């Protein structure tokens, strides 16, 4: 190992921890954060042995999947996907969910997190509809990005030596496929309110086992937990250490701004958050936390109480900090 590989290996020791230095791992890995975090996680969960995944097929698929995130998109890139994968991996290990999910369900959630934004062009669903894009025409204006992320992520499995599921039974693949689709479609923000409503209902009627672990009889409850889990991981930036959070805010703002520039050059009304001439980055973060991120994470906290109390406290501190900069 070179000196660089020893440092990367040292950083990969935090893969079970909230607030892994995902940006450092991106650098140290040669802009391969998604490949090496996914590989590290499959080895940590013993997923190659369980599902008989050839290590070379895994790496080949991951590189190809990573290749299909856009290096020139400021936020929705391979780093974001590595971060959602890693955050989902931590959420799966929460005490209140020990022994709840099967290895197939855990693999579906981690796989869904990896592909969940692949080939993202850096512009919103609404932009794609408003501009009469091929994607919007293909998908009839409904979860346009999220359907595409799924189609690409599954299609790459067909490339040469890329089918990491080749040793699953036909039943296993079928169930995994449906779960992944269910999970990635749940990342569309236009599903957020109804997804949170179901999660609140579940919290209020929560049933536990004799060990104190969540009890989920049926597909409907199990998939809804997984959907919200990946959704929380997708919206986990404000819950991270401040120096991670602020970098995610810089990147999402740059990407929103470049969408607003494209709306400018096309004579369109500039979407909220996308006008770099009338922006309010701090106030918008506080609003997003207050109307979206905190309602979601407070409810997830309730579901697994008290496993997530520190994540929720970091969220609240980060909100107070952004708030404190406004006046």
Ligand X SMILES: COc1c(O)cc2oc3cc4c(c(O)c3c(=O)c2c1CC=C(C)C)C=CC(C)(C)O4
**287 contacts ligand X (rule: CB under 6 A):** yes
Burial of 267 by CB count in 10 Å (0-12 exposed, 13-18 middle, 19+ buried)? exposed
- Please identify which of the residues 76, 120, 148, 231 carries the catalytic annotation: 76
Q: Is there a contact between 66 and 162 (Cβ–Cβ < 8 Å)?
A: no
Rounded to 10 degrees, the C-alpha dihedral 315/38/229/52 comes to -160
- Minimum CB separation of residue 80 from ligand X in Å reads 9
| DSSP structure string for 121-184 | -SS-HHHHHHTT-HHHHHHTTSSHHHHHHHHHHHHGGGSTT--TTTTS-HHHHHHHHHHHHHHH
- Minimum CB separation of residue 24 from Mg ion in Å reads 24
Q: Residue from 83, 146, 163, 234 that binds Zn ion (CB under 5 A)?
A: 234
Q: Residue from 284, 295, 298, 299 that binds ligand X (CB under 6 A)?
A: 284
**273 contacts ligand X (rule: CB under 6 A):** yes
Which residue has its beta carbon closest to ligand X?
272
Q: Is there a contact between 74 and 122 (Cβ–Cβ < 8 Å)?
A: yes
Is residue 277 a known part of a binding site? Answer: no
Q: Stretches 38-46, 114-122, 152-160, 282-290: which one binds ligand X (CB under 6 A)?
A: 282-290
Q: Is there a contact between 214 and 97 (Cβ–Cβ < 8 Å)?
A: yes
Q: Residue from 11, 105, 117, 263 that binds Zn ion (CB under 5 A)?
A: 117
Is residue 116 a known part of a binding site? Answer: yes
Q: Residue from 288, 297, 300, 322 that binds ligand X (CB under 6 A)?
A: 288
Name residues contacting ligand X, limited to 226-245 (CB under 6 A): 237-238
Q: Residue from 102, 272, 306, 324 that binds ligand X (CB under 6 A)?
A: 272
- Minimum CB separation of residue 291 from Zn ion in Å reads 18
Q: Is there a contact between 315 and 239 (Cβ–Cβ < 8 Å)?
A: yes
- Minimum CB separation of residue 28 from Zn ion in Å reads 23
**146 contacts Zn ion (rule: CB under 5 A):** no
Q: Residue from 105, 117, 163, 255 that binds Mg ion (CB under 5 A)?
A: 117
**Dist CA 213 CA 278 (whole Å):** 48
39 has catalytic annotation: no
- Minimum CB separation of residue 231 from ligand X in Å reads 12
Is residue 237 a known part of a binding site? Answer: yes
**Dist CA 163 CA 76 (whole Å):** 24
Q: Stretches 185-193, 214-222, 275-283, 291-299: which one binds Mg ion (CB under 5 A)?
A: 185-193
Nearest to 148 by CA among 135, 137, 158, 130: 135
**What are the residues whose beta carbons fall under 8 Å from the beta carbon of 237, sequence distance 6 or more?**
83, 244, 245, 248, 249, 252
**Dist CA 290 CA 57 (whole Å):** 43
What is the total count of residues that contact Zn ion (CB under 5 A)? 2
Is residue 76 a known part of a binding site? Answer: yes
Q: Stretches 30-38, 114-122, 259-267, 275-283: which one binds Zn ion (CB under 5 A)?
A: 114-122
- Minimum CB separation of residue 320 from Mg ion in Å reads 27
Name residues contacting Zn ion, limited to 237-296 (CB under 5 A): none
Tell me the longest C-alpha to C-alpha distance in the chain.
61
Neighbours of 203 (CB within 10 A): 16
Rg (CA), the chain: 19
Q: Which residues are catalytic?
A: 76
Interface positions with Zn ion (CB under 5 A): 117, 234
- Which residues are known binding-site members? 76, 80, 116-117, 234, 237, 285, 288
Interface positions with Mg ion (CB under 5 A): 117, 187
- Which residues are known binding-site members for Mn(2+)? 117
């Amino acid at each position: 190992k070179t000196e660089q590989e020893d440092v990367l290996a040292k950083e990969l020791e935090d893969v079970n921890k909230w607030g892994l230095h995902v940006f450092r791992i991106a650098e140290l890995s040669g802009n391969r954060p998604l490949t090496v975090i996914m590989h590290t996680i499959f080895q940590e969960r013993d997923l190659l042995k369980t599902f008989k995944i050839p290590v070379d097929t895994l790496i080949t698929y991951l590189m190809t999947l990573e290749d299909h995130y856009h290096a020139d998109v400021a936020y929705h890139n391979n780093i974001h996907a590595a971060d959602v994968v890693q955050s989902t991996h931590v959420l799966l290990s929460t005490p209140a969910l020990e022994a709840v999910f099967t290895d197939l369900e855990i693999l579906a959630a981690i796989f869904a997190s990896a592909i969940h934004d692949v080939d993202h062009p850096g512009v919103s669903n609404q932009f794609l509809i408003n501009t009469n894009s091929e994607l919007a025409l293909m998908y009839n204006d409904s979860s346009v990005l999220e359907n595409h992320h799924l189609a690409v992520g599954f299609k790459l499995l067909q490339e040469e030596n890329c089918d990491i599921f080749q040793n699953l039974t036909k039943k296993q693949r079928q169930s995994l496929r449906k779960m992944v689709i269910d999970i990635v479609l749940a990342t569309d923000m236009s599903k957020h309110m109804n997804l949170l409503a179901d999660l609140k209902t579940m919290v209020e009627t929560k049933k536990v086992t004799s060990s104190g672990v969540l009890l989920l009889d049926n597909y409907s409850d199990r998939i809804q937990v997984l959907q919200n889990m990946v959704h929380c991981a997708d919206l986990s930036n404000p819950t991270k250490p401040l120096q991670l959070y602020r970098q995610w805010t810089d990147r999402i703002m740059e990407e929103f701004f470049r969408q607003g520039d494209r709306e400018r050059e096309r004579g369109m009304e500039i979407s909220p958050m996308c006008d770099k001439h009338n922006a309010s980055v701090e106030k918008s973060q506080v609003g997003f936390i207050d109307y979206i991120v905190h309602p979601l994470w407070e409810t997830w906290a309730d579901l697994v109480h008290p496993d997530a109390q520190d994540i929720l406290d970091t969220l609240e501190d980060n909100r107070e900090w952004y708030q404190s900069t406004i006046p």
